[PDB]
């Protein structure tokens, strides 16, 4: 949201299996959901968060 | 022969069938049995009950290594997803952990057309 480096804030928005949690469950404003998924997407590329529980 | 005592039960449960494979932590195959094996064909093979006796028959050809603890890896939908683990726990096994491993593409390969039955 304010940054992909905030893995602390970001972990609260993923499931046990690393899937992005929809705005519905979180009740997050609609603009930031996007900022959030894009920052989660950035953190995944950089191996700061997993794509899947598998690895 | 040989000793393991800490293993893993891999179950492949498709709609037409389910297959049980027992393994060590490394992934080396210890024993296996399938639903189509124990008789049952077509309409009967694809049942939880047929999956149950597969799980039973698999433990009757692996305790040669004397397993005592294991984790479970559930792949596929259909029956014998759920009933297979139960038969396992009753065969004399403390079951430690369960995890679903059904593969999920991140939308890659195109599947077959819908069946117009």
């Amino acid at each position: 949201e304010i940054d992909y480096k905030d893995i602390a804030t970001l972990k609260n928005y993923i499931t046990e299996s690393g899937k992005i949690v929809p705005s519905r469950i979180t009740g997050t404003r609609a603009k930031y959901q996007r900022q959030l998924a894009r920052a989660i997407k950035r953190a995944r590329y950089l191996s700061l968060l997993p794509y899947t529980d598998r690895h | 022969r040989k000793q393991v005592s800490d293993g893993v039960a891999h179950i492949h449960a498709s709609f037409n069938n389910t297959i049980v494979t027992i393994t060590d932590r490394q992934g080396n195959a210890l024993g296996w049995a399938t639903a189509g094996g124990s008789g049952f064909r077509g309409s009967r093979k694809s049942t939880p009950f047929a999956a149950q006796v597969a799980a039973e028959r698999c433990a009757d050809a692996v305790k040669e290594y004397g397993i005592k603890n294991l984790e479970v890896m559930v792949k596929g939908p259909g029956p014998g997803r759920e009933s297979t683990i139960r038969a396992l726990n009753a065969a004399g096994f403390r079951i430690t952990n369960i995890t679903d491993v059904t593969p999920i593409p991140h939308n890659g390969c195109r599947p077959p057309k819908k069946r117009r039955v």
């Binding site: - | 049942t47 939880p48 009950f49 149950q52 029956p79």
Partner: protein
């Protein structure tokens, strides 16, 4: 029974022993309304069952009944074009009747010379759980437990 459920008629007790239960038995064994001849086969078998069992008369009956009593059964069901077999836990009241009905049915399917003898050797066999009717209880469990999966 689409809408109207009912209570059950609670037949009179057996004239000789005063048991509603054994009255439920003669009815199950009775044929063509020959009541007069129905209690005749049931008692004479108990007289044969009593002597040979020794162990009273009222209790001897139940020991055989204790066995063929079935705890569970299966109920047919048609969901998505498939006749699934759903195993239901069955109530005590009916549990004895089945025990009674299979005991009665195996006796005619027997080799002996008369009905009193067929009946006596069936109770005796059942007392040791080793007859036709017990196997019917065992098939019920074999048929059940198979569909243990659905419940």
């Amino acid at each position: 029974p689409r809408r109207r459920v009912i209570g059950q008629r609670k037949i009179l007790p057996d004239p000789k022993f005063g048991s509603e239960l054994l009255a439920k038995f003669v009815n199950i064994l009775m044929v063509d309304g020959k009541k007069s001849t129905a209690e005749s086969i049931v008692y004479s078998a108990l007289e044969t069952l009593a002597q040979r069992s020794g162990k009273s008369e009222l209790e001897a009956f139940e020991v055989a009944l204790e066995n063929v009593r079935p705890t569970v059964e299966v109920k047919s069901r048609r969901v998505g074009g498939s006749t699934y077999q759903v195993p239901v836990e069955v109530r005590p009241v009916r549990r004895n009747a089945l025990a009674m009905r299979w005991i009665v049915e195996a006796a005619r399917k027997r080799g002996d010379k008369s009905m009193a003898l067929r009946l006596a050797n069936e109770l005796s066999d059942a007392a040791e759980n080793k007859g036709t009717a017990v196997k019917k209880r065992e098939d019920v469990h074999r048929m059940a437990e198979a569909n243990k999966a659905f419940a």
